Design a protein around this ligand. Structure first.
Ligand code: NI
Length: 234
């Protein structure tokens, strides 16, 4: 039927069976269509913010004759869902900052029991910080690459926020991923090894620059980051 990318395929696998899912900023409503068609989800909501992506999602769902189980809605983030409407929420193809913003702006729509499957393009840390604060528990993480690009997928549900971080510092865990850190797969090492190298270059770059209170502060943070990364790729 519909084919999904490795990235969204990964996301779909965490959808609880018979779950009603809400895909925020749904890409053509493919993921939700795919989930409902494969009976992974019982029903779904596909949220779009702009007119274009909205009409096109509505048309695909209509074209696919999935209007009966899929509701394409227009709105900002979780603005499209009603409290206790969905059992799983997927937010992918966005930056960690946005995802965290979406979650925070619409946490009124959350009961807390909904399973969150978040796929940040970058700065997954913003999501972990938000999750820890709203006490959620990370139940799993995956990091893979597709078409020469690495992508992370975070899965969370109500639970004990510290559990997943047992054995690792919140500081590091939140940045690289507690589960990811334990796994230490090729994609993970490559991503963070490069990040560290990039951090060192800025450190040495700022090092040669002026000796100002500002640059020394900027260096302190780079150092903290470097040591942090060093501890995760040992
Ligand atoms: Ni960020």
């Amino acid at each position: 039927e519909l084919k999904l990318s490795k990235r969204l395929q990964t996301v779909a696998e965490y959808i609880p069976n018979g779950a009603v899912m809400a895909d925020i900023g749904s890409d053509h409503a493919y993921l939700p269509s795919y989930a409902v068609l494969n009976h992974k989800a019982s029903g779904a909501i596909a949220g779009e913010i702009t007119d274009g992506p909205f009409l096109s999602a509505k048309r695909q769902v209509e074209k696919s004759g999935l209007n009966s189980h899929i509701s394409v809605r227009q709105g900002d983030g979780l603005e499209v869902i009603k409290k206790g409407e969905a059992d799983a929420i997927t937010i992918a193809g966005m930056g960690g900052a946005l995802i965290a913003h979406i979650l925070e702006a619409g946490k009124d729509k959350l009961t807390g029991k909904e399973r969150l499957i978040l796929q940040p393009n970058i700065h997954a840390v913003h999501i972990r910080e938000w999750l820890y604060k709203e006490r959620y528990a990370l139940i799993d993480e995956v990091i893979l690459e597709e078409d020469g690009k690495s992508y992370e997928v975070l899965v969370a549900e109500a639970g004990d926020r510290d559990a997943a971080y047992d054995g690792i510092s919140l500081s590091a865990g939140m940045l690289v991923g507690p589960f990811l850190a334990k796994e230490k797969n090729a994609v993970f090492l490559k991503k963070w090894t490069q990040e560290l190298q990039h951090t060192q270059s800025i450190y040495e770059q700022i090092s040669q620059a002026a000796d100002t209170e500002q640059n020394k502060q900027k260096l302190k943070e780079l150092a903290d980051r470097m040591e942090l990364l060093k501890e995760v790729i040992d």
